[PDB]
Symmetry: D3
Subunit: 273 residues, 6 copies
Amino acid sequence: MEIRTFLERALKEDLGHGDLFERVLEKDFKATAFVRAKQEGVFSGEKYALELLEMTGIECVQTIKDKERFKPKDALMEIRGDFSMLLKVERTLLNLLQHSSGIATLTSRFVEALNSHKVRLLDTRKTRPLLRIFEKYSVLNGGASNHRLGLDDALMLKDTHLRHVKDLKSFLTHARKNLPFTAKIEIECESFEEAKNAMNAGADIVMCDNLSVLETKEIAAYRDAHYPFVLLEASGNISLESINAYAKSGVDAISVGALIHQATFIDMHMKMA
Amino acid sequence: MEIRTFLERALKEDLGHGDLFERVLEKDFKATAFVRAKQEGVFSGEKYALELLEMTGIECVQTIKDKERFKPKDALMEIRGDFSMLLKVERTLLNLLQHSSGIATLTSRFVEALNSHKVRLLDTRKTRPLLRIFEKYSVLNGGASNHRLGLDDALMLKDTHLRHVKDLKSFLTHARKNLPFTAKIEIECESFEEAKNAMNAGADIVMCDNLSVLETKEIAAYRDAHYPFVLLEASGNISLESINAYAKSGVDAISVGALIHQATFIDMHMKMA
Amino acid sequence: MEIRTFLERALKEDLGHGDLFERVLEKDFKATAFVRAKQEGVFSGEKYALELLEMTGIECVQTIKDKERFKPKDALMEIRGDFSMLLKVERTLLNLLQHSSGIATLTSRFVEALNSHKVRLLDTRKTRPLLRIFEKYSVLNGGASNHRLGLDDALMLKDTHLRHVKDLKSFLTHARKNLPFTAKIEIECESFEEAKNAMNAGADIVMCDNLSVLETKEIAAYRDAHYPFVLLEASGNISLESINAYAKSGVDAISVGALIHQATFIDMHMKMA
Amino acid sequence: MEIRTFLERALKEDLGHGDLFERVLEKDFKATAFVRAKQEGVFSGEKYALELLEMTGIECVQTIKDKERFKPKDALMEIRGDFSMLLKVERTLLNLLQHSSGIATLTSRFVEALNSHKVRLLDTRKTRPLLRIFEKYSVLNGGASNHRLGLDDALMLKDTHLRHVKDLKSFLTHARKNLPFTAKIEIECESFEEAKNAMNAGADIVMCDNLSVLETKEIAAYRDAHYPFVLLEASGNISLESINAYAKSGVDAISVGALIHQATFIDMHMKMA
Amino acid sequence: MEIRTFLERALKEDLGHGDLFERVLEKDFKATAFVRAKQEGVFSGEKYALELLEMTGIECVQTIKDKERFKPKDALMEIRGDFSMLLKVERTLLNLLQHSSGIATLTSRFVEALNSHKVRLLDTRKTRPLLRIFEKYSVLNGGASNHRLGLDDALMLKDTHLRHVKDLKSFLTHARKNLPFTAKIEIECESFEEAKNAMNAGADIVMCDNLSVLETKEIAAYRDAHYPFVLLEASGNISLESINAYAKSGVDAISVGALIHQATFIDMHMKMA
Amino acid sequence: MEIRTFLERALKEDLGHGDLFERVLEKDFKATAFVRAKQEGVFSGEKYALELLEMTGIECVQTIKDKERFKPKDALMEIRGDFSMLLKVERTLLNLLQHSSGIATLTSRFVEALNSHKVRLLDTRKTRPLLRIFEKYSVLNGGASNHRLGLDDALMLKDTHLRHVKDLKSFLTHARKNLPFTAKIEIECESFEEAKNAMNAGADIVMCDNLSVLETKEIAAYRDAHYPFVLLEASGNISLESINAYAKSGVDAISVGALIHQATFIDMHMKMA
Ligand SMILES: O=C(O)c1ccccc1C(=O)O
Ligand SMILES: O=C(O)c1ccccc1C(=O)O
Ligand SMILES: O=C(O)c1ccccc1C(=O)O
Ligand SMILES: O=C(O)c1ccccc1C(=O)O
Ligand SMILES: O=C(O)c1ccccc1C(=O)O
Ligand SMILES: O=C(O)c1ccccc1C(=O)O
């Protein structure tokens, strides 16, 4: 399976040479445990939690679903298995859920402020080492959308790359054959002119980077007049207090890396009840 | 190397099938790039950064060290190598330094508020999946100390465990020969009575879990009168606004997991020329 | 590096417990060897060959380049290193070059018959186990283009998927948010009607699957009239004797899986000269 | 299992970051699919197919066996499982069976042309990277035999080696104690004289590399008169139109690497309902 | 699980390219076998054996348990599975059990001659490569106790480490904020004057390296005068003929690496029947 | 390389989470150490040691070589590197050399008591888990010879395998087309009447299992009457006090697993200075 290795390594990291408690534990036995919330939020990590449990021979009697909301004291999952194994898994199972739900919850906040069904909230490639896929999955459970998953996923050209491209329209036209047939090219822009030249150069997507709502709005309109099939994305240090204003500019999407890199853990815990 | 694989995994996740730009960059060349700050903070991730650069074939001309403070606009690292590799490694490098430094910086604020040279600040086993060692290393670079690194490091018995241990003293006595000779045992207590009976049980370390400063002083005092070689640790949602008060409690260490799980990325970016 | 693991496993597979010859070999010594051609063709596998040599401490004095043509008796590479290691690497190094150049050469034939710079020749996801990336790279060196590299690369819907989609236009419109922001959706069609409905449904690409040149031509024209930004691909059992005719229908690309699955080894060998 | 990892690698390469359809398939369900033929041929890959299906959680209702012949339109396998997994595994399964069967079928035509029950047909160490064991297994399913599987299997000295061995007899004599007790030694010869002196040197097997049938009979005869326990093998661009002639040469085996490196995919496809 | 990788690798080394018998066997059938002893000793390796059979298909019908004594002829295990898999696992099963029991048994003889319950037998970091966890687990089954399991488990300082500092006091006092909070510091000493310094330094344990019983007692008693909590261990060489002598010297533990680095296999064997 | 993975894993088991000393050390410096012997024996493991130091940074200044004899006090290796890396590698370096030399040396004593050059000493498939290649390599360094290295190396039939067929003749005659062309078939026998059948069956080797010298000679001589080429091996138990006796029995080899499964470490140690 796609994430069985992820969980093995998550786990491996915690018990190193071997769990000391399992050595001292007099007799083992089947026990039931519950994962309870200590905060409110959106639950994320279900897919990873079931694989971890499966992986370790722990049964999953009950669980809420990946996009469900919850209040503190809510039981999130009811698991049953060896006492020794519930303990060896506990922190891994909880770090998983707490981290992942933290992102879904922070993300849900933005989706909320955004308030629009026509405009999409996107994440970024700013993720923590080894958690690209894990965190991207989290953002989804919060109610938003994912941007490309990597550098193989699509071509994104910004100032760094552009500074060395003599003729952009020429470059894009002739790059298409050295890129897979299905790839889209996106050009990051910092002005209306740049955006205009990008659309005419052949871009499939233009990123209005660090531009006022007015600026963006102008670009959005121009795209509507000419290049109606080119996609527009607004990006920059967009805050919760800033998102709604941008959703009205006409861009198709808004990306805020903070959805992942500014998210923190939600409080949960395991009761052997 | 120890963290060699870690760095390979972080990279793979990002280029997947292969970086696309690399396919269209007509002519590759050596270039220099700078990792600049956009926020003040404590630098962390040097050990990883340097290993990433080396296995990647990029040279490190200059770089500040693992604990230096810095302010916006400051140049943190100067690297040189193939243009194509600089771009392929960019996000991995930054995400790495921004995440590691975020934790160090956050920890930094607790080390100050704590304000002590006798009471050490510790982390927890609450760490993001696959980033334990990474996040623990990060905490060290903020000026604090580390707690055990795993379930193999030492034996820590809490509520769940204790509910099945009827006679501690005896349990702890006979547990010794089944643990590695060097292991220490720690017991979480939520009342003066629990701590007192843990000390008498033969505990090496006692945790004062969610107790007023007064409550804690009481245990600290008792430990000094009798049981002078038992380490006391206080923990329990200990905020930035209360650690200092707890530092005066008379404890040896104060553990706050938020140093890691409530930390966020420090703004940083890579710039050519 | 991206393909260092590929080569380790290629190699590992050949010497199993350990090369027997290196046991019996009296004295080792630096020797020079040449990879010579025994057929004509396009050379492919340079990127993999240099990594293998590097990996095993073999120097690469000279080599032709990945898209260069060659006649039999041509020296392709001049390598130098331990006699024992040249022998342990020989077959791996040659299977690499022979297989990879076999694909580039068969591919070059199609590019030739195609005779067009406006139309692109694409491969498919029909590759040999564990060689997806290796073979895709080969097709490029033959002078053609790659189709998506996998199922994460782009969405491709065909009869199998469509049979369960009530309203296609609705499905595509609402799928966009659950797919990364940069993904393109392609619909495989087996009639002019299907193609027409696909473009109107919202597809970014339509595949004219198993359609006469006339059929294709009709679809190509319609796309030009309406939906000028939708991409067209002709596919099916297109033969060398059939490609040129299709290149004149108006489609943007033609894909033939045979480029990879009908390619065979080119004759080469290593002379210790 | 032995081929467990192999199958994991093949799959990973295909879904990379994750299958996209899976993201948009609104409702998953169990379904049945058939693997049908579009060409006549010999079936191969059952061992791999079944392991792929099992680790993938797909059931195998029916399947023909590893050596059965088949014709177009024939249903080769009947499988059942989640719709989403059937689609994610489709290409990997087919590519696997089409490649394995291609080799078996091609080998099949040589086994016939050879037409003998005393002379066995062998493959070579010329196999596509990472597919050695896979391709060798495939050859077995065509009705032929396998040569050694690697450089550890046995010791085969050819031109390159021999140019540095001045006194074979002596070399072979003292080589024995440095090889594993069970190893056999083989020596490639390109003339009656070379073979004769190899036999006398103490060779277990002699290869008649690129020699007329007459030339070979000469060596075969000599081997029968003296050295009756030495295995003779003939090889050297031995085509489908000459093996039979060589079978009568008096050799024990005829090796042709093209059984693997000139084989191509057998047309096959997966169909629901 | 935790040692499933260990077993895959073990089994991987024996079969390599693939077991030859299975290519010969006509029809496979389910058969039973018995791991029977041919010598007297203490059984060990039940944990790995059961995991090996499970991940390998073979069914475990009956088995004595870790730490149970046995005599020649005794049947230690009864397994059930395919004729081929039993033959393929046989060697790997026995090597585990024999090497493991070999260490348990030799350990039990030191345990026996130690004759004490206030003193425990320890092992060392002197283990065969890749087998530490395996061999440490084997010692426990002999009835003794394990020492730390690696350099991450605890800090063990000796001359080479301390060659150079002036303080032990401050060195140790400051090494504390750099070690995980729960880690102990043991110091190896060679003279009373040394052990004396360690205790005044702040050590948590002291090793009396190959000293005399009269030398040890001086320290044992001194340890009681003050520093009643600091543990004492003192084997440097010790032997069966000298363990007991030390047990009555006043130390808490006696480590002897020979329990592992001097153990040899126990005769066992698998018989179908 | 081929055993670089072996070393990474070995070193990985010792440090785990990370060496503790390095978290304490103030300033690291380059230092020298000497692997000195404390016992007499035959050196082995030069191959792994040099690879371990290289991949680990430490520089190898001087070293005796595989198969060279040494006495107590003798300096076997002189290494140069960082103080930390030497301490971190020490244990892992010695365990390799000691366990390896331990096997070489014990093997050399059997070689010595065998006193023959027309008869070679073999080892068995009785090796510690994960150490076969290592231990087989260690025997060679003792001056003896290795047997097959696994079940893929050759086919070795005994009662359990043959319990059931009627023919050996046809069984073997047909097992040939299913085994790689270069593979040998050895048959273990327990009585003249058995070895007699094997030769008439077509065996390539025959093992005289724990028989008497008079029993062996009957077969040795018989082997000469007819079947001069089929090799003979005959140890079943053999010992130092009985090897020579067999060497003069007429067999080509004498295998004794005890060379490995009875070897113990050789005393060595690392000293800074
Ligand atoms: O990380 C970025 O620079 C980034 C920012 C916004 C959207 C997309 C990306 C991306 O690279 O995928
Ligand atoms: O996560 C915990 O329960 C924990 C909390 C505080 C200190 C230490 C730990 C630990 O297990 O290492
Ligand atoms: O393999 C196919 O069905 C296929 C065929 C033609 C183009 C693209 C693909 C693809 O899936 O990428
Ligand atoms: O590839 C070769 O050189 C080769 C050719 C013919 C038979 C066997 C081999 C072999 O090495 O196994
Ligand atoms: O090998 C050693 O130096 C050693 C010796 C005796 C006990 C413990 C150890 C240890 O380091 O764990
Ligand atoms: O372990 C055995 O049965 C064995 C014993 C002696 C020689 C060789 C072997 C072998 O199988 O390679």
